A paper describes a structure:
Unlike other PLs, Smlt1473 present in the clinically relevant Stenotrophomonas maltophilia strain K279a demonstrates a wide range of pH-dependent substrate specificities toward multiple, diverse polysaccharides: hyaluronic acid (pH 5.0), poly-β-D-glucuronic (celluronic) acid (pH 7.0), poly-β-D-mannuronic acid, and poly-α-L-guluronate (pH 9.0). To decode the pH-driven multiple substrate specificities and selectivity in this single enzyme, we present the X-ray structures of Smlt1473 determined at multiple pH values in apo and mannuronate-bound states as well as the tetra-hyaluronate-docked structure. We have built and refined the structures from residues A22-L330; electron density for other residues outside this range was either weak or absent. The structure is composed of 13 α-helical segments (α-1 to α-13) connected by 14 loops (L-1 to L-14) and two β-strands (β-1 and β-2) (Fig. 2, B and C (i and ii)).
To gain insight into this possibility, we analyzed the statistical distribution of B-factors in different apo structures at pH 5.0, 7.0, and 9.0, which were solved at comparable resolutions of 2.63, 2.20, and 2.45 Å, respectively. The protein is least flexible at acidic pH, most flexible at neutral pH, and has intermediate flexibility at basic pH. In particular, Smlt1473 has maximum activity for polyGlcA at pH 7.0 as well as the greatest spread in activity with regards to pH (>75% of maximum specific activity retained between pH 5.5 and pH 8.0) and also the largest observed B-factor. However, significant rotameric transitions of important substrate-binding residues such as K42, K162, R163, H221, and R312L have been observed at different pH values. At the entry site, the residues involved in rotameric transition are H221 and R312, of which H221 has an altered orientation in all structures above pH 5.0, whereas R312 has an altered orientation only in the pH 7.0 structure due to a hydrogen bonding interaction with Y225. Y38 and Y39 are part of the N-terminal lid loop constituting the R3 surface of the entry site, R218 constituting the roof R2 surface of the entry site, W171 and Y225 forming the iRW surface of the entry site, and R312 forming the F1 and F2 surface of the entry site. At the exit site (Fig. 8D (i)), the pH 7 apo structure has continuation of the high atomic fluctuations in the same left side from the exit site view (i LW and ii LW surface) and includes residues such as K42, Y115, H168, and R215. We found that pH 5.0, 7.0, and 9.0 have, respectively, two (N55, Y222), four (Y38, Q112, N167, H168), and three (R215, R218, H221) residues with the highest atomic fluctuations at the [−1, +1] subsite. This generalization implicates the pH 7.0 apo structure catalytic tunnel to be the most flexible and rationalizes the less numerous and weaker interactions for the ManA cocrystallized pH 7.0 structure compared with pH 5.0, as discussed in the previous section.
Author numbering: 22 to 329
The structure:
């Protein structure tokens, strides 16, 4: 039933693929080279996200056990604890943040089924990847753009699934830095600097912010309400951009790639007073993003976890 997990490689070798200062114009060769270099990591991430999707779909214990088995194996292997191997940038470090987000959300989805010895393998592994990730943001030079929000989501998810307050606190701080970056006009200055991908990077900064408030909701906290619902200025800026890129074109130094809004809409439409603004985006799913915990359509409908 449960296939043999792939080996866990202790190192990540990722490749940056933007040619401009604005981090907006893709070199096709470097992108493919990145794709082939991360393919095992992407496959693993997809696989645990999918098996945890199945657990939530119908309660099948065999799905949870297989998800847990896959996570235990990469824990036992010390996967991604090795050197983050730079090539042209910190793409490897970004990859470990996204990989934590995937594996930590996968774990959280199936935690109810985890036996004491599975928790003792998996918990310490998530906790070191989480700390390893944070340590990168201690350097005062690294601007805390959308990547800091992606860092936060897995640090928070790990904090929640492993019951480590240090990492819950550090998650919360990432989220709140994000909410307080949201200008009066719903823009984020560090994302506005991303030329033709400025609108894409607002969608990409909002997603982990929404999933972090969704985790806060698992603890019965409402973080959507931070700063008199400041998050709703970003959501409105993004859902309107996806319909019409004109505001972004007028406020950036390049013509925007048009946006299909990502699966954060599945959650936001259910929280939001007036979800109808999300009808077109919702029609373009289902939304699968292992990075954000797998099947966002399933998790918005049925919850991120089966038993509180």
């Amino acid at each position: 039933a449960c296939p043999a997990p792939p080996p866990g490689q202790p190192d990540i070798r990722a490749i940056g693929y933007y040619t401009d200062k604005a981090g907006s114009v893709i070199d096709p060769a470097l992108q493919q080279q990145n794709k082939d270099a991360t393919a095992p990591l992407d496959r693993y991430a997809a696989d645990v996200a999918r098996m945890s999707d199945d657990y939530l779909r119908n309660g099948d214990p065999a799905a949870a056990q297989c998800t847990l088995s896959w996570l235990g194996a990469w824990a036992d292997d010390g996967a991604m604890l090795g050197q983050m191997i730079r090539v042209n940038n910190d793409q490897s470090f970004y990859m470990r943040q996204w990989m934590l987000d995937a594996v930590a959300m996968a774990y959280l989805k199936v935690h109810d089924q985890a036996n004491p010895q599975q928790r003792a393998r998996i918990d310490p592994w998530l906790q070191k990847l989480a700390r390893a990730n944070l340590a990168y943001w201690d350097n005062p030079k690294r601007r805390r753009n959308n990547h800091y929000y992606w860092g936060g989501l897995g640090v928070l998810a790990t904090g929640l699934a492993t019951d480590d307050d240090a990492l819950w606190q550090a998650g919360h701080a990432a989220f709140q830095k994000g909410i307080d970056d949201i200008q009066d006009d719903g823009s984020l200055p560090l994302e506005m600097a991303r030329g033709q991908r400025a609108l894409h990077y607002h969608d990409y900064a909002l997603a982990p912010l929404v999933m972090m408030a969704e985790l806060a909701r698992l603890r019965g906290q409402d973080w959507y309400a931070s700063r008199n619902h400041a998050i709703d200025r970003l959501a409105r800026r993004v859902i309107e951009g996806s319909r019409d890129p004109a505001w972004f074109n007028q406020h950036t130094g390049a013509a925007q790639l048009p946006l299909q809004a990502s699966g954060w809409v599945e959650f936001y439409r259910l929280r939001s007073p007036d979800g109808g603004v999300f009808d077109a985006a919702h029609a373009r799913g289902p939304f699968h993003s292992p990075r954000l915990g797998g099947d966002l359509t399933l998790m918005a409908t049925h919850g991120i976890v089966r038993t509180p």
